[PDB]
Amino acid sequence: MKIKVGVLGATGSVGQRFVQLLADHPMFELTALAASERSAGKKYKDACYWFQDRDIPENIKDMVVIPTDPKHEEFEDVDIVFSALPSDLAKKFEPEFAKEGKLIFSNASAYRMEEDVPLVIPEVNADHLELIEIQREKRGWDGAIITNPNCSTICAVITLKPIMDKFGLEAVFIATMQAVSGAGYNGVPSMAILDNLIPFIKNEEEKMQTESLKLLGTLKDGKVELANFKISASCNRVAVIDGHTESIFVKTKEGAEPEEIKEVMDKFDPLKDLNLPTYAKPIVIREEIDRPQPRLDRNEGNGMSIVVGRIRKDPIFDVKYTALEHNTIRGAAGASVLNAEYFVKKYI
Amino acid sequence: MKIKVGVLGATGSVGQRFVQLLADHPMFELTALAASERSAGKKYKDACYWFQDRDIPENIKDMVVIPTDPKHEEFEDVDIVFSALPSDLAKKFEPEFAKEGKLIFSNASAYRMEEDVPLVIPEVNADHLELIEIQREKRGWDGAIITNPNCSTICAVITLKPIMDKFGLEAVFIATMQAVSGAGYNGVPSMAILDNLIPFIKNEEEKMQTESLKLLGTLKDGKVELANFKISASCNRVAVIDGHTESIFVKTKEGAEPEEIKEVMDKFDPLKDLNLPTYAKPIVIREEIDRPQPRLDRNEGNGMSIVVGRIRKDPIFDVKYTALEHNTIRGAAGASVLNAEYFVKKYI
Numbered sequence: 001m002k003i004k005v006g007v008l009g010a011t012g013s014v015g016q017r018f019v020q021l022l023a024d025h026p027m028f029e030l031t032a033l034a035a036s037e038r039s040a041g042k043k044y045k046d047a048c049y050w051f052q053d054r055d056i057p058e059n060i061k062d063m064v065v066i067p068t069d070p071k072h073e074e075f076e077d078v079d080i081v082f083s084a085l086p087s088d089l090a091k092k093f094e095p096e097f098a099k100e101g102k103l104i105f106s107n108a109s110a111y112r113m114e115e116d117v118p119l120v121i122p123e124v125n126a127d128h129l130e131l132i133e134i135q136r137e138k139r140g141w142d143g144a145i146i147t148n149p150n151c152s153t154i155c156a157v158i159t160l161k162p163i164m165d166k167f168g169l170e171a172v173f174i175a176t177m178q179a180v181s182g183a184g185y186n187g188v189p190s191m192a193i194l195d196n197l198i199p200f201i202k203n204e205e206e207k208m209q210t211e212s213l214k215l216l217g218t219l220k221d222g223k224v225e226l227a228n229f230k231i232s233a234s235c236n237r238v239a240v241i242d243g244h245t246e247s248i249f250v251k252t253k254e255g256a257e258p259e260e261i262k263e264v265m266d267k268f269d270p271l272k273d274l275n276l277p278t279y280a281k282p283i284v285i286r287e288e289i290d291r292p293q294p295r296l297d298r299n300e301g302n303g304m305s306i307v308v309g310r311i312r313k314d315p316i317f318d319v320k321y322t323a324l325e326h327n328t329i330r331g332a333a334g335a336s337v338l339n340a341e342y343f344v345k346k347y348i
Numbered sequence: 349m350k351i352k353v354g355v356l357g358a359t360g361s362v363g364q365r366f367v368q369l370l371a372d373h374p375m376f377e378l379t380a381l382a383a384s385e386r387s388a389g390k391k392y393k394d395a396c397y398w399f400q401d402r403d404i405p406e407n408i409k410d411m412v413v414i415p416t417d418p419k420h421e422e423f424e425d426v427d428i429v430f431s432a433l434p435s436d437l438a439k440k441f442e443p444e445f446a447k448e449g450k451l452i453f454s455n456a457s458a459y460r461m462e463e464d465v466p467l468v469i470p471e472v473n474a475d476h477l478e479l480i481e482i483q484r485e486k487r488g489w490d491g492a493i494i495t496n497p498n499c500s501t502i503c504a505v506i507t508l509k510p511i512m513d514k515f516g517l518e519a520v521f522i523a524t525m526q527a528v529s530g531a532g533y534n535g536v537p538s539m540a541i542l543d544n545l546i547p548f549i550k551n552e553e554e555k556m557q558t559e560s561l562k563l564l565g566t567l568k569d570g571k572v573e574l575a576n577f578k579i580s581a582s583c584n585r586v587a588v589i590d591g592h593t594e595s596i597f598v599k600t601k602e603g604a605e606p607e608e609i610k611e612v613m614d615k616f617d618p619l620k621d622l623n624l625p626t627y628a629k630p631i632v633i634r635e636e637i638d639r640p641q642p643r644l645d646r647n648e649g650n651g652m653s654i655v656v657g658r659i660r661k662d663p664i665f666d667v668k669y670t671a672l673e674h675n676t677i678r679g680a681a682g683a684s685v686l687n688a689e690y691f692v693k694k695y696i
């Protein structure tokens with residue numbers, strides 16, 4: 001048997017990655033696909049303008065899309081709902097599903113910074129899922145909202161976590177070169193990135209500078225106490241389909257050599273024995289001079305591994321390096337799926 | 349004015365920009381075009397695989413390419429010779445031209461860090477041209493080798509200069525997103541940047557971390573005393589034809605607000621009213637949220653203006669901002685042409 005699952009915003013960029021991950025899954029059975037009123041009524045293949053380089057999973061093609069309605073009869077037997085909704089629709093619909101007793105695993109920014117909402121990467125702050133007990137008391141529902149972080153934030157935080165545990169953190173500079181896929185099919189126009197780039201992604205730097213502090217914070221007396229290190233981000237959009245690349249410069253508390261930083265990242269593997277279907281080694285170290293590269297490395301761990309290269313001495317801080325993340329798997333859909341897999345094993 | 353000039357490596361990427369700049373110049377007349385023996389004897393149009401979005405200037409098309417030989421008949425009345433040679437060929441040919449009493453204005457990295465060789469941006473360190481007198485003593489030739497810096501270095505240094513004069517410099521972080529045209533026509537393969545990027549450009553970070561200190565250093569007792577601020581670069585190659593974009597994070601000595609940084613950059617204009625043909629305002633400030641963009645802004649000042657946008661507070665240092673440079677004009681050919689214009693108008 002399997003836990004029956006649904007997807008909100010199933011036809012969009014993240015939704016399609018949810019669909020790929022859940023079509024054939026050992027724990028979860030995809031039984032419900034939700035989108036807007038326009039898509040509701042049609043087969044998934046017709047409602048969705050599919051833009052993945054692998055075809056729609058065969059068992060999902062003819063699955064009829066339903067409206068985003070928690071009390072719809074197709075949602076009655078589903079226990080876990082994955083959300084790929086835009087933020088404003090997430091504020092409306094996600095509490096509705098939680099009131100119906102359903103577990104919401106959301107990529108939307110809406111509830112990320114709420115004090116009773118877990119903002120989780122399972123390798124980093126799994127214990128923050130304890131906030132659901134608190135959430136249920138204060139909100140009065142028996143469901144739950146669990147959020148995964150912003151894609152750029154996940155990439156940085158995974159690499160920073162083992163460093164912080166061993167050497168502490170003082171200050172982090174990050175410059176990103178971000179793919180277009182997360183903005184949706186009609187998100188980034190061709191002329192924004194054709195022989196061009198954009199040195200701006202609305203709210204991206206703010207998200208990186210704030211979400212990171214909660215993720216690397218400490219749960220204490222029913223609240224997450226934000227981390228105290230300093231963080232400055234500069235975000236950019238480039239002509240890449242999938243894969244966010246980050247130039248990261250790190251100042252530790254204790255001081256650290258590049259070889260020591262490499263070691264803690266390589267040994268970082270807190271989820272190895274948990275038998276999670278979407279598991280991958282958190283950080284894969286490249287020794288090549290010109291790696292990671294989005295096209296060559298984004299499929300690492302089926303899109304779930306962060307790939308790090310060029311770990312070297314920084315003239316100013318301690319260490320600088322390049323990190324790559326599949327922005328749409330580890331950065332979103334995979335982040336929530338891993339969250340859900342971990343949640344049913346360890347929580348309730 | 350019709351001062352006769354030559355171009356070394358005239359057929360390559362920087363060579364073509366030299367040709368564009370010098371074909372119809374109010375001071376210089378292009379009379380000699382030098383390249384390899386493969387190209388020698390051919391009309392420029394046949395020898396050069398021209399890849400600029402504007403056609404070869406009509407007067408240069410039928411001009412016969414000559415060998416790279418300072419003794420050549422076409423170099424007799426030519427005192428000013430521009431060099432777009434690769435470094436290893438520059439080490440061979442540039443001293444040969446200096447020995448023939450010619451002034452080499454070079455984009456090659458070969459002689460940049462020689463202590464008797466000027467490494468000059470006229471807006472920044474025009475006084476470093478005095479090094480040619482020390483150079484003539486040491487080397488025993490009556491010509492000179494005068495270099496412009498690395499394209500990435502120029503962009504950063506131009507922005508840092510007015511900041512250093514007013515507020516001083518402690519530390520600078522730079523992350524670059526670099527166009528492909530600098531590597532030459534056969535430099536960056538399509539599959540390096542098609543739905544991809546390379547987080548590495550050989551020796552680029554080293555150049556930025558070393559050349560900057562000479563450019564911003566103080567000439568004293570016939571030597572440049574290197575600047576003492578800390579600098580760390582991360583360089584990347586992206587799918588852009590022309591235009592290098594840099595994310596810069598600056599820590600000043602005295603402390604500064606974004607508006608103060610904006611003001612000193614906007615007022616930075618030491619070369620105005622000299623009637624230099626290749627003059628442009630050094631730094632153009634964009635107020636838009638998503639500017640500068642390579643395709644929109646690289647033509648600013650005909651490729652000679654550095655374009656800066658998104659000047660804002662840094663959570664760690666004082667200020668962060670985005671800088672853009674046309675990498676082949678201001679970054680290379682225009683850099684040396686401006687050097688030579690300043691040379692006749694100010695140095696002789």
Ligand SMILES: NC(=O)c1ccc[n+]([C@@H]2O[C@H](COP(=O)([O-])OP(=O)(O)OC[C@H]3O[C@H](n4cnc5c(N)ncnc54)[C@H](OP(=O)(O)O)[C@@H]3O)[C@@H](O)[C@H]2O)c1
Binds near residue numbers: 358432456676679
């Ligand atoms: N584009 C930019 O913005 C930029 C900026 C900074 C630096 N650069 C420099 O430009 C280089 C790459 O571009 P590119 O396409 O110009 O390289 P390239 O194709 O090697 O062209 C440079 C010159 O060297 C070549 N050459 C080979 N053997 C020669 C010889 N015996 N004598 C004279 N020239 C010889 C070419 O001559 P033939 O064509 O006749 O073979 C050409 O004229 C890099 O090394 C870099 O340092 C470019």
Ligand SMILES: NC(=O)c1ccc[n+]([C@@H]2O[C@H](COP(=O)([O-])OP(=O)(O)OC[C@H]3O[C@H](n4cnc5c(N)ncnc54)[C@H](OP(=O)(O)O)[C@H]3O)[C@@H](O)[C@H]2O)c1
Binds near residue numbers: 036084085107333
């Ligand atoms: N993919 C990633 O890796 C990733 C990472 C981070 C963030 N994101 C997020 O994903 C978003 C952009 O991607 P996208 O193209 O998926 O956007 P989107 O298509 O607008 O959002 C997903 C869903 O919203 C749409 N929608 C419009 N009106 C609706 C309604 N009344 N009820 C339910 N859905 C409605 C789509 O339905 P129809 O198709 O039926 O119109 C459906 O695909 C951003 O807002 C961003 O926050 C994605």
